[PDB]
Symmetry: D2
Subunit: 331 residues, 4 copies
């Protein structure tokens, strides 16, 4: 005579198992900005939230659940134990120490590598066949780290990389040209950093190379100072940090973007961190942003951008800087 | 000739006037939740952000702008000034103090009225025809204050109210019954706070009244404790505040749902805060949530819900509770 | 070296297996409406189209494929064969004869059963675990046929039923009351046809029962003729058939709503066709619409709606009406 | 004592006036494919349908209304008199004679020009400040026609033009390259026809010019026959017509695309028909596809694509052919 029993006549029972489960490791500024964006885009049927902060974790879980009416993701779960993560199609890693005002993203390495040595083995134990998407900084070094510990194939380990950088770039060009960013094409390659390479030779609006119309555009001295657009891209992260303390909405939106190409298998081209040994005459084990076709299996192919010798100059530059650091690890 | 003049041939200038402009006043946890939710629902063609904290403001703006590629709201602007808010269809006010742990929303009244005394005349002046959506707590009292200061007809001054408490109610009912919140119907009327009323006479799943199946349901001391679901609703804000410090995701979702009915002129019914003088024997000018039909002109109608004598009793004590605080008229 | 080999560096092959694959059987007016609605809701990652008319089929496929840039379903395929339908989560059957002007849906039974006798075993063989969504008329009887032929548990054989009649009901109620269909609640149970039942005991706006306010509502010969709203529901198919020849947009929308609850495992309640033996004194194996809770496994539960003696009477005569045609067992 | 009056307490009344109204002239294959696509994308709050076929018109109106529950466009109206069209932000023209198997789209001119002389003056009388979007064939000639009769500024008269052609192109390249169409960039310029110009010099994946890697690509004799991709683009319309009788879904989706850039004012670049006198050394009053930045005011700017002398050769070719026809009109 329970209310439920007078009202509902049961046929079937509690299968469980989700088809499109997404996990978000770390429920901080970035982790919740990723979660909100991924929920609004309706990509998962089950989202799993993991943090070591128990109170915060349960608190953000509840705030998202409270919003159930308005969502189309009926199972929202969280925990400290990784069992909650089981059979995730995608695992977004956002956990770690973030930059303090004026901090070099390369200073976070000690602290974040200790976090990864801990969580990678726990996430791979429960989801042996997931696509890892690393957001934590320094993202290029940390993607290598996940790869190295997890033992996964180079296709299932992605670093958010220069998706955000190129998104800032398009936005900045778009404001100069008076065209929506969607319509200005421009790649920010290499390190998700201070040593990122603007590929000037590829910047265009509706198939027209801005470099043929303006050969002065790019890595020099004279102009309408297009070169300062690349500079505001390198600086934008710092200025936002100085103004609000951290960055979050642009990264959350750029994660939902990659998350959509993985979940729907669209095979779209995105500048993301991948293993580049055997490609720009880079002979080491580095991870850096290159245009990659992203799908349900992760990175299935890399696009061999036609780089000028100056641009290929800065890519072995960005790439060496980066490996300098990496051998000091080795664990 | 600029690179701009070489690439693009101009055909017009013109007055870029916004058609679906939304203003968010206060760029805090609640304001940005509102903002992101409204941007992902693609309700606005221009969003304006106003805050007194100049840096925070610029910061949130740039973070949002860098995500431009991923949104469909081409213009995002901000200022301390209010000239930026001109010709807004709707303005969402989230400015002010929030609860500290264990604090009643009624306790913020004096500080928030002090801020509304400044903001309302600057809003009313630049968007003579906007709809005001009041989020700041205690929401019922600030909605009356907003009304009073503004000089606006009642139809155009809306408190976010029990939209959110109703969502939380439906979620909790949902859990117990094994059905999505969307198929569980139930209303939380009165104060958006401790004195809210569960309308158990009306809780249904597919037209069937749970109070008809289980006459002991709710405001009954008997057997399966449905009454504890209302206590959880009441307590839910306090409980997320104790765990993460503030609530934000649920209300940003609830506001974008409201925002949707208003911008698209949907004529949906939402439990929101409005002037209930005349209805339910209410002789005082108090604001509280009652089911309202929401459209391009704000509140066009109020639904006369048929309250059991015990639910009417409880609604009255709720407006009695709000008027007690309301005789303070510090404006 | 191809231009392909020069542009792109490959990292993998792999088995492109679909995760959210939808099959639409029959590429007519109803099948393409279903198809477009399901593609715009971005429910599938692969859609397969099967029809016997080879040319029409190729045609609809190419039209759809040319719109690829505007959709997020990367793979669209078709064939006469059924090998193309493998590992589908859901299959929407819209194949068969439709009504000529003035024709009862019960009249198509013999022709459509002849087609189901061929299609069902070819479906059941290649997607052992799909959910069957039956659209072909008379929908109630073909759902039973589909069930019977298939060997599938009842939970996985769904008729589109009164989902659509309920939508039409809510629309009409909507008009009269001045509120969006979304805020008007009401159910059309029984046969998806002339014998359907309006459940006036349950029609509400915000929890308030219209039958409580106006006791003469509906299955009453008295004053404002709410009963004429049900007559319009019954008649609506006949009337659009006389004016444009067939109905298509409403049912494609109604099917994509259903499709949504199933793919995302929403657990929403929809009036759909299922086996009602045991409920409401129904001693025969007939299919008809009753409020059902819909999820990744199909029908997991049936809601026991509390019918007035006159509504129970009318539901019985509706299953009595369907069983009369049902003793024909030509399969 | 009406039901409505016991239930609803009125505050406000029937304002009317819509903010985002869209009109669709012609409710045939294309007109309803435009309407469905525009409704699913939620761009209008009011849609107006106009046709001379009264029965068909009312029948499609009803089928769309029946689907109200599932939509977010609460006013759906139709008529034979243009008063229904009043104060439309956008008017989509789809009315006219369509191609029979093997018919040259230039043969429809007599029949469609008689239709336009009739409807243009009626649509401009009710919406003096609308953006006209012409879809009817031959679209280039007919856009000129609307321009000429309406007396509108060249910015508010757009022809759907080569949006569809370039959408087919990307789709075809995308299948060769194994990349989503979204990611392969390629412009089909000129006549929405048989004399359309593929701009090979602008085709790229992630900023890399396929022509620098493969100089043989394009307008010649040797290869991997990329030139046949342009040919299937020219032929695709005919083959779809031969297979299903007409084309509709790809055009409907491409109209919703432009409709979104106009309604939301995104300022996106699209290949659409516009007045090109004073641009490729074309000295006449022709309309042909060029990359244009599209917004709330229509075409605000044109992008001066860098064309090879061969490509500029075929653009004055396409453009002359086209004006040959046009002087025979003059009305
Ligand atoms: N790649 C990009 O473009 C990008 C952009 C912005 C920020 N980031 C990075 O994201 C990271 C997080 O920044 P943020 O603002 O959200 O930080 P935050 O302080 O707000 O949150 C970090 C979260 O990590 C958690 N954490 C620590 N150890 C953990 C463990 N074992 N498991 C789970 N969680 C653990 C914390 O408890 C905290 O909740 C930083 O490394 C930052 O640089 C990357
Ligand atoms: N109604 C609801 O259901 C509900 C739900 C949650 C929170 N809230 C209320 O939301 C309000 C905002 O909450 P919060 O977390 O975002 O606070 P917060 O401190 O994060 O941000 C409040 C913001 O208000 C701005 N502000 C203050 N005075 C201002 C003024 N005169 N002009 C402009 N901006 C001004 C601040 O500078 C700050 O950025 C609080 O009153 C809170 O209680 C209501
Ligand atoms: N349940 C509802 O509410 C509802 C609503 C509308 C229409 N319908 C029903 O939808 C069905 C389809 O309607 P319609 O307008 O699209 O018809 P239609 O003639 O437009 O298309 C029917 C299609 O079925 C295909 N077909 C027939 N036999 C086949 C077989 N063995 N295998 C494969 N395909 C086969 C045809 O070749 C044709 O393309 C009819 O039975 C109609 O009554 C039901
Ligand atoms: N530009 C493109 O890429 C493109 C692509 C496909 C089709 N088209 C064109 O669209 C047009 C329509 O094709 P379709 O399949 O929908 O045709 P259809 O036969 O299905 O419909 C044409 C509609 O026009 C109507 N009509 C005739 N005179 C009218 C008047 N004064 N006012 C209103 N409506 C009137 C008809 O009654 C009919 O309903 C054709 O000219 C065709 O070439 C353009």
């Amino acid at each position: 005579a329970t209310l439920k029993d007078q009202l509902i006549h049961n046929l079937l029972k509690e299968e469980h198992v989700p088809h499109n489960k997404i996990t978000v490791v770390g429920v901080g500024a970035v982790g919740m900005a990723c979660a909100i964006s991924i929920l609004m885009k309706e990509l998962a049927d089950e989202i799993a939230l993991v943090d070591v902060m128990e109170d915060k974790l349960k608190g953000e879980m509840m705030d998202l659940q409270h919003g159930s009416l308005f969502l189309r993701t009926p199972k929202i779960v969280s925990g400290k134990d990784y069992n909650v993560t089981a059979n995730s199609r995608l695992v977004v890693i956002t956990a770690g120490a973030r930059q303090q005002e004026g901090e070099s993203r390369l200073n976070l390495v000690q602290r974040n590598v200790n976090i990864f040595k801990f969580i990678i083995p726990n996430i791979v134990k429960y989801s042996p066949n997931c696509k890892l998407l690393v957001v934590s900084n320094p993202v290029d070094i940390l993607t290598y780290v996940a790869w190295k510990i997890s033992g996964f194939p180079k296709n299932r380990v992605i670093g958010s990389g220069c998706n955000l950088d190129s998104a800032r770039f398009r936005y900045l060009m778009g404001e100069r040209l008076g065209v929506h960013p969607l319509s200005c094409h421009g790649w920010i390659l290499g390190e998700h950093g201070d040593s990122s390479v603007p590929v000037w030779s590829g910047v265009n609006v509706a198939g027209v190379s801005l470099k043929n119309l303006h050969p002065e555009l790019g890595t020099d001295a004279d102009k309408e100072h297009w070169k300062a657009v690349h500079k505001e891209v390198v600086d934008s992260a710092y200025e936002v940090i100085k103004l609000k303390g951290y960055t979050s909405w642009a990264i959350g939106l750029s994660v939902a973007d990659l998350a959509e190409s993985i979940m729907k298998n669209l095979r779209r081209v995105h500048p993301i961190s991948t293993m580049i040994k055997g490609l720009y005459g880079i002979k080491e084990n580095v991870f850096l942003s290159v245009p990659c076709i992203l799908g349900q299996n992760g990175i299935s192919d890399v696009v061999k951008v036609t780089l000028t010798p100056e641009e290929e100059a800065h890519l072995k530059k960005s790439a060496d800087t980066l490996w300098g650091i990496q051998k000091e690890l080795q664990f």
